[PDB]
Structure formats: C-alpha cells, structure tokens
C-alpha cells in the first residue's frame, strides 16, 4: 500500500510547487484520483488478509477506513476553500499540506501491522490536528481546546507506550499477525487487570467515553470545519480501530474487566444524547451526538460478539460520513449567519431550498431510518447488547427515543419555522457547498446498497 | 398587530375587552344564532347595569368578580377564527412569505425575465435610501424629551418625507402569497 | 379612545405607500419573459407495457431460474378433482349424511 501513500506524499510537493491561483484544483483533483487508487484494496477475493509487505497491511477492518481517509481529504480541501481563502498564499499551502499529512499519517495508522507503528503514527496525528484547530481556530478559546485535545490523548498515550513495550518483552514482537496466531492469554491478576486498562484507556480516550469526552465538545466547537470533519470522521475512529486490533491479546480479562466501561458508555449514551436536546450551539449538539453514537461503539467493541464488531464497523464508517455531513452543513450556516447559535437562522428552507434536503437526509442518517447502513449498525449492536443482558434494551431504548428527538429538532429549529427577519441577508448557496454535501451522501447511498464491504473482520 | 401596546391598561379597556371575550365565548356554548342573539343581549344587560358605578373601588370589584365568573364559565374549545393566533390557519401561509430582501441575490438571468418588475423595485429602493437621513433626523429632532417613551412612531409632518421607518410596514410580505 | 390624530396619519400615509408597493408588485404583460398523442394510449402502453416487459424479463429469467425465489402455497385440491400431472382423481368423500 504505497500508492495510497506515496502518491499522497507527493501531494505535498504539489501544494507547495504549484501556482497560488491553481494550488487548490491540483490538490483536490489529484486526491480524488488518490481515492480511486485506494478503491483497489477493496478487491479481496478470499478471506485471507492482504499483507502488502512487512510493515504495511490491510484487512477487512482497515480497508473500509483507508478509503474513507483518502475520500475526506478531497472533501476537506473543498470545505475549507472559503475560510482560508482570506489567507496570504503561504498560510493556505500550509493548511492544505496539514490536511494532506493527516490522511498520509491516518492511511498508514489504519494500514499498519506493528502496533507501536500504530502508536507513533497514532499520536503523531495530534500534531497536524492541533495546528489545524489552534492556528486557524476562530474563537478565543482554541488555545484551551488545543490543550485539552493534547493532554487527554497524551496522558492516555504514555500508558499504552509502556504496555506495548511490555507485551513485546512478554511475547517478543508487536506484529499484529503473529500476536494473533500466538498464545497470549492474560492471567487475571491484579496487574494484568491493569495492563488491560493501560492498552484500552488510550483508545477509549480519543473514542470519547462518557468519563473523558469533554475534550471532543470543546475541540470541535472552535476547530475549523476541516478539523471538525477530520476529528469526527477519522480521528475518533482511530480509537475504535485500536480497540479492535489490541484486544486480540488481553483475551481473558475483558470478559469481566469491561463491565465498568460498558455501563459508563450505555448510561453515557443516554445523558450525552439528552444534553443534545437543549444545547444552543449547533456544532455543540453534533459533537455530543458524536459522543453518544460513539458510546454505542465502545459498547460493542467490548461485548465482543461477531455482530457487535461489524455493527461497530458498519456504524463507524456510516456515522463518520453522516457526522461530517452534519458538521459541513453546520459550517455553511455558520459562515452566512456568523454565529453558531441554533435559535437564530430559523426557516432557512424558505431561502435555501436544497441545503434543506441535504439537512433532512443527514438527520435521517443521524436517527436510524431503516434502508440506511446507520440503522443496520445500531440494529446489530442493539442485538448483541440485548444478548449480553436483555435489560440493555431499556438504556439503548431511551437513547433511540432521544436520538430521534434531537436529530429532528436540529431540522425543526434550523431548517423550518418562519424566516429570521433580517439577519445579514443570506447569500445563495455556492455549488461547492452543495457538492461537498453531495460528495458525503452519494457514498452513503451507494454503501447502503451493498453493506458487505464495510461489515468488519467478524463477518 | 399594527398599533403599539399601551403601557398599563385602563379600567375601561379591561372591561370592554371582556365584553369581547365574554360574548365570543358565549357563542361556543350557544352555537345556534338565535339562542345566541338571545343569550347575549342578556349579557350586555349585565355589563349595561353597573355601567355608571362611580365608585371605582366597586367597579374594580365587579370587574374582578366578572373575570372569575367568566374563567369558570368559559368554553374549553371556543370559536377562534381560522386565521388568528391560536387558530387553524395561523401562520399557515408563512412558508411562502419570503422577506423580499432576497430578490437581491438573484442571478442576472433570473432577473432578466420579469424585467419591468425590477425597474419599479429599483425605484422604491431609491425612495428608501433617499429619505433615511431626513427620517432618522426626524425621528430624533422629534424624539421626546427625557421621560416616558412609547413605541409609537411619528407621521411625516412635511411634504416629500416618508413616514419614518416605513420600509418594513410597506414592503411587507403579502398576507397570502397563496 | 380613537386613533391619535398623529397615528391616523402614520397609518394614513404608510397605507398609501403599501397600496403603491402592491401595484408595483403587479406583473406587466410580457413580464414572465420566456428564455428563448393518442391520449392515454401513449401512457397505458408506453408507461405500463414498457415497464412490464422489463419486469417480466427479470421475473421469468432471474427469479424463476434461481432456487426458492418464487414459492407458492400448494394449490388446493378438494374431493373429486383431477390432478393435472399425476392424473390422479382425488377420491370422493364419504357421503356425509344428507339433509341433516
């Protein structure tokens, strides 16, 4: 997998060497094709994993993501052509390159055989992200948000560093292939009960768990649209990908060491879903929607039943695409409105007829409408959770009712009701804004036709 | 909706606004017109008497026991008109009342057709900018001395001037864009 | 009460302007400048038959062909009928006592 990567690196030379006026089209047009080369990995004609080479591999779980990581770079660069079009021609070429490095790094992290290669690349992605959030962040508080995003991930990260070096000494190689075909069975000691927490905690932090998710609402609030898309679509899912590949070892402990997180997540799912119900900042509501719909995932990567896992793989890819779509349209309202407040800007369909159709489809993806991969995902996690304990439906049942309420409230108070009297007149929709959306949903429609590709390792 | 709300309400407007709620809440209980036109001229009688009470205290003691008699003898589902707040068509057609400052972002192609329309629209926009100065100055030269200030706005008071702040009472979306 | 003599002129005048705005809203002749079949038989067949063919192509050459794609409750056989394939004549039922 060096075509999904080397051609990517070369994007950096192109963003720099290219003309200031033509820099945007060379980069966006080329990475669209970079995504097309990424699609070749999907050609798996047998169940064996495609080990491209010693360090680089792609199995069913990584492949559905590498393609998404390559896909969003085009979109990210199309959603940030407006803001970042007021810059000095060298601030742009920095932002474009920053976005380019994220998927170079993220493509490799999702396509990495050695778990510590994951760690080095895993924690590197913070550098590009923190720059995108802090350097271009509009609000006074991004310095703070950046600190929260760096420390919560970093304090979790050093325990994983110690744990992975620890298993290398215990087993003798951090190669995901071998670690899988070798006998690593923890022994339920008090210490192992700590190892397990060391490995999972760093992944559980960037996958916002109810206890440590305050970093994500603060980060996406002041982050520029491209950073918020990256955090929701690819960055948070880095934590999920890690939990799937790391729990191959630590096989016995999670049977009983998971209860704490599972309950934290399911109760967390309800409270995070509910506070979405009365949050005035739209970007705030989407972020907590992201916490709740990701709290379902940590509760399926821990129950560990075949269906959970691919419920997880289905939902992660699906929610990634949906969340960005929501964060992308939130930005289009923010740029014309100039405020994140949900109460202002009422009645837009009256003035932006189509964006409202995109808003409606994004919300229906947000809630579980049935001919969507989003629902298949939740339906499956719901099933397994029920298997874990029939009572789980109650808590995963209060979340579904709340999820319907906030998803439609975003449509009802932003895209319906009487028009706002006279905010700065709202200029019509650009074709870029609409495509950036179409590019998010057309793939959501196509993937829903053949869900098999994003089903995970389990199935 | 047009005129501005008075600060405090008088005795009269409180009495005379019960005569409306009352009679109108008597046409829910008494639906047939005859029964109504009967049971209602009997209502006026109630208000007709106790009309000349000069004893304010008393008057405000007949009013406060009238509006409690009424609250307990009101109809739960009165007859509120179709297009009035609380009605059945209230704000129905508002999905078609776009705010008119939106025809300014139309593509030169769209505005190409419908041409005489925009020829008259550009006249009115000249009227609006041609008076903002004389208006705001009027609004100010005639601003009240410090003290009670109501939301009532002044008329023109000079030829050529246009009533101050007139761009959104005129140029207001048509009630039923249909 | 009664309108204040200076509010029956701000409604006097502004109504006069609203009347002109609504006149201006009226469209002139030419205003909507336009930028430079057997009845139901063009439908019944074109819009129903054309689809039908395709469907049939699909149902008689994919579904029918694939296993367990169009399954049907057994046909009903009563006392006395002749099964087409076997030719078996379902035996008549015990006479139930008539005129019960």
């Amino acid at each position: 997998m060096l075509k999904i990567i080397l051609p990517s690196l070369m994007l950096l030379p192109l963003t720099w060497l290219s003309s200031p006026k033509k820099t945007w089209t060379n980069v966006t047009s080329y990475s669209f094709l970079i995504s097309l080369t990424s699609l070749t990995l999907l050609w798996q004609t047998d169940e064996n994993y495609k080990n491209f080479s010693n360090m680089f591999s792609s199995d069913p779980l990584s492949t559905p993501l590498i393609i998404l990581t390559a896909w969003l770079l085009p979109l990210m660069l199309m959603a940030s052509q407006n803001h970042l079009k007021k810059d000095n021609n060298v601030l742009q070429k920095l932002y474009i390159s920053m976005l380019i490095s994220l998927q170079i790094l993220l493509i490799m992290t999702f396509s990495a055989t050695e778990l510590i290669m994951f760690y080095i690349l895993f924690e590197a992605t913070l550098i590009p992200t923190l720059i995108i959030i802090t350097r271009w962040g509009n609000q006074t508080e991004r310095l703070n948000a950046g600190i929260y995003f760096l420390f919560y991930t970093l304090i979790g990260s050093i325990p994983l560093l110690i744990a992975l070096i620890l298993i290398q000494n215990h087993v003798g190689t951090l190669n995901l292939m071998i670690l899988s075909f070798t006998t690593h069975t923890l022994d339920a000691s008090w210490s192992n009960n700590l190892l397990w927490l060391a490995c999972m905690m760093a992944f559980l932090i960037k996958m916002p768990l109810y206890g440590v998710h305050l970093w994500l609402p603060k980060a996406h609030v002041e982050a520029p649209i491209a950073g918020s898309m990256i955090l929701a679509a690819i960055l948070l899912k880095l934590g999920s990908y890690g939990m799937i590949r790391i729990s191959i070892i630590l096989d016995p402990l999670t049977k009983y060491m998971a209860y704490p997180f599972i309950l934290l997540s399911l109760w967390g799912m309800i409270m995070t879903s509910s506070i979405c119900l009365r949050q005035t900042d739209l970007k705030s509501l989407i972020a907590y929607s992201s916490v709740s719909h990701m709290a379902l995932v940590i509760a399926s990567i821990m129950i560990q039943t075949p269906w959970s896992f691919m419920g997880a793989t289905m939902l992660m890819i699906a929610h990634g695409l949906t969340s960005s779509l929501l964060f992308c349209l939130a930005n289009s309202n923010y740029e014309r409105i100039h405020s994140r407040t949900m109460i202002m800007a009422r009645g837009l369909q009256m003035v932006f007829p189509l964006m409202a159709t995109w808003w409606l489809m994004a919300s229906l993806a947000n809630l579980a409408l049935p001919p969507s991969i989003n629902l298949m995902g939740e339906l499956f996690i719901t099933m397994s959770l029920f298997s874990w304990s029939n009572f789980t439906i109650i808590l995963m049942g209060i979340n579904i009712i709340i999820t319907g309420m906030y998803s439609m409230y975003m449509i009802i108070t932003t895209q319906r009701g009487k028009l706002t009297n006279h905010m700065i007149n709202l200029q019509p929709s650009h074709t870029r804004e609409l495509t950036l959306m179409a590019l998010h949903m057309i793939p959501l429609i196509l993937l829903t036709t053949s869900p098999k590709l994003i089903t995970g390792l389990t199935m | 909706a047009f005129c501005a709300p008075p600060a405090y309400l008088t005795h009269q407007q409180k009495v005379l606004r019960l005569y409306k709620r009352a009679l109108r809440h008597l046409e829910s209980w008494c639906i047939h017109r005859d029964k109504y036109r009967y049971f209602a001229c009997l209502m006026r009688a109630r208000f007709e008497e106790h009309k000349n009470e000069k004893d304010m205290m008393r008057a405000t003691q007949l009013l406060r026991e009238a509006e409690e008699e009424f609250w307990q003898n009101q109809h739960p589902q009165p007859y509120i008109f179709p297009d009035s707040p609380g009605g059945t068509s209230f704000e129905r057609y508002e999905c078609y009342k776009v705010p008119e400052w939106c025809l300014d972002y139309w593509h030169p192609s769209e505005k190409a057709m419908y041409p005489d329309y925009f020829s008259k629209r550009e006249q009115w926009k000249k009227l609006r900018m041609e008076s903002w100065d004389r208006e705001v100055k009027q609004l100010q030269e005639e601003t009240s001395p410090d003290g009670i200030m109501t939301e009532a706005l002044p008329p023109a008071r000079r030829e050529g001037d246009l009533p101050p702040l007139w761009w959104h009472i005129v140029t207001r979306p048509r009630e039923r864009p249909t | 009460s009664g309108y204040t003599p200076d509010e029956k002129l701000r409604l006097q005048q502004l109504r006069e302007l609203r009347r002109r705005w609504l006149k201006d809203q009226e469209l002139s002749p030419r205003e909507p400048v336009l930028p430079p079949a057997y009845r139901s038989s063009l439908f019944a067949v074109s819009h129903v038959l054309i689809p039908m063919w395709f469907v049939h192509y699909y149902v008689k050459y994919h579904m029918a062909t694939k296993p367990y794609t169009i399954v049907s409750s057994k046909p009903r056989i009563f006392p006395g009928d002749t099964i087409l394939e076997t030719g078996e004549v379902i035996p008549p039922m015990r006479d139930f006592p008539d005129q019960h």
């Binding site: 932006f352 019509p428 | 776009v98 939106c102 192609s109 769209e110 419908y114 864009p177 | 469209l27």
Partner: peptide
C-alpha cells in the same frame, strides 16, 4: 392581475 411572487433565488 398576475402578481410577482418573490422567491428565493433558485438558479444556484
């Protein structure tokens, strides 16, 4: 008396 019906710009 056909009347002009204001509408959001619908070309974009």
């Amino acid at each position: 008396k056909r009347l002009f019906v204001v509408k959001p710009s619908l070309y974009y």
